[PDB]
Every structure is written in structure tokens, then in C-alpha cells.
């Protein structure tokens, strides 16, 4: 069939590294690119094609119990060992990541259909907002 | 509510750059990380949490008509200008990306519920397989 319509989920990617290197993509970008999987959405009408490709990385699962300190390796980030303790302050979930970095942790709460996440490290604060799907 | 269960799609990410820099994440990784959006799947049962986070990049749309040469800027890759021409060889979609790189192009075909994509650049071949979702 010439019909390539559909949503296509990558299952295999062989020698992406060699192809990217032939294109002169730099080492640090290749190190990340070889871990992604693509989803390809093809809209085909005759000989007219529209291809919309997204690349995804699965970060590592984080499982914890509130009040139980646990060892965390931040492999999706700076790859450091921290001792994390999550507690409730009202409806706000508060995490202290005890380790080399001062004032490292996060706070997480719901307001309406939005999830708020504030990440801290030193004097830096990152504010993220998520919509319920 | 303390109930953070659900699938949460990132809509806003403020000062991820400053947070990542405080964590000493290197420049080339930060340049990519600030373009991602996260989906967070939270499975909460009491004070027990399971968080599964995926990060996604939307590559650029590729629209073309078979037989009509078009200008392509490979911004999701090596950011080069090529003149791409897609033609059918039987049921195989064949693309030649005319430009600085020799033997650059791809071939794309369906077999069963699988989409096959072979990317070439110079003497390098990358083979990708996609499953219909």
C-alpha cells in the first residue's frame, strides 16, 4: 500500500549515532538524541503529505511515601545522589533533597485543574504549571 | 485537595535555565532541555506516590507533494538548507535531499502494520521501524 496515513510509534532506531555524526551533529546533542523515541503523525491525501513528528524521552520513575526519606539519583538531570523527604504542609507537597546543593527541593500543589510545581536550588526558583488532561 | 492523581500536561516552565545552571547541567544539555514540555502521570494511593514523567520535543512539520521539489531547513537536526524531491518507486517513498552532504536522503514504506524509514548520509544508513498505533 501507498497509504502511509496514521500515527506511528517508533519501536527501533539503528545507527542513529552514525547518521547524526555524518551530519556533524555535536557530541552532546547526539548523546541525548540516541535516547529518544519518535511518534510520527502522517496526514496523507493523494500525493500531498503532512508529517508531524514528536520526540520523547522517558524520565525515570519516582516512587515515594510521604514521611519516608528515600535515596534519589537525579539521573534525568545532574545525576547526583540526594536523600529526599516529602511531607505535607496543608495541601502542599513539600520535598527537601538533602545533599551537596543547598536549598534543593520542590513544592507541588493543585489549584483548580492546574498542578503547580516550584523547584528550588540555591537562589534559583523554577515555576512549572501543568494542566489536567 | 491532596489528590494529585492524574495525567498532567506542562503548560508553563519559568526559569528552568537558571535552575539547571544551579545544578551545573552543561550548556549543550540546557539548550535542548528548555525546549521540552513534560507530561506527568501521578498514581497516588494515600501517601504512596508513583510519578512517571516524559519529556517531549515537537519537531518541525514537513509538508510536501510527491514530485514537487521543495526547500527544507533541517532545524531539528543539523540546521542545513536542502532541496528535497520525493518520488514513488512502487510503494516506496524516496527522498533525495540535494545539498552539501553527498547521498543524503531517505526511503519510507509500509509492510503490514509497520512503517520502515531508512535515512542515509554519506556511507551511513540509519534504519527506523514504527508500529501503527
UniProtKB/Swiss-Prot annotation, chains A, B:
Keyword Transport assigned: yes
Binding-site list for all-trans-retinol: 40, 108
Main location: cytoplasm
Example GO BP: vitamin A metabolic process
Keywords per UniProt: Cytoplasm, Retinol-binding, Transport, Vitamin A
A Pfam family: Lipocalin
Tissues of expression: Higher expression in adult small intestine and to a much lesser extent in fetal kidney.
One Gene Ontology cellular component: cytosol
Subcellular location: Cytoplasm
Function: Intracellular transport of retinol.
UniProt domain comment: Forms a beta-barrel structure that accommodates hydrophobic ligands in its interior.
Membership in a protein family: Belongs to the calycin superfamily. Fatty-acid binding protein (FABP) family.
Protein name per its UniProtKB record: Retinol-binding protein 2
Amino acid at each position: 500500500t501507498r497509504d502511509q496515513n496514521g500515527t506511528w510509534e517508533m519501536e527501533s532506531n539503528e545507527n542513529f549515532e552514525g547518521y547524526m555524526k555524518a551530519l556533524d551533529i555535536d557530541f552532546a546533542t547526539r548523546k541525548i538524541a540516541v535516547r529518544l523515541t519518535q511518534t510520527k503523525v502522517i496526514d496523507q491525501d493523494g500525493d500531498n503529505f503532512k508529517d508531524k513528528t514528536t520526540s520523547t524521552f522517558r524520565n525515570y520513575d519516582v516512587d515515594f511515601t510521604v514521611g519516608v526519606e528515600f535515596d534519589e539519583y537525579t539521573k534525568s538531570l545532574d545525576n547526583r545522589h540526594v536523600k529526599a523527604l516529602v511531607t505535607w504542609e496543608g495541601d502542599v507537597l513539600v520535598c527537601v533533597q538533602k545533599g551537596e546543593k543547598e536549598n534543593r527541593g520542590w513544592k507541588k500543589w493543585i489549584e483548580g485543574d492546574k498542578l503547580y510545581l516550584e523547584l528550588t536550588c540555591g537562589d534559583q526558583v523554577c515555576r512549572q504549571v501543568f494542566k489536567k488532561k
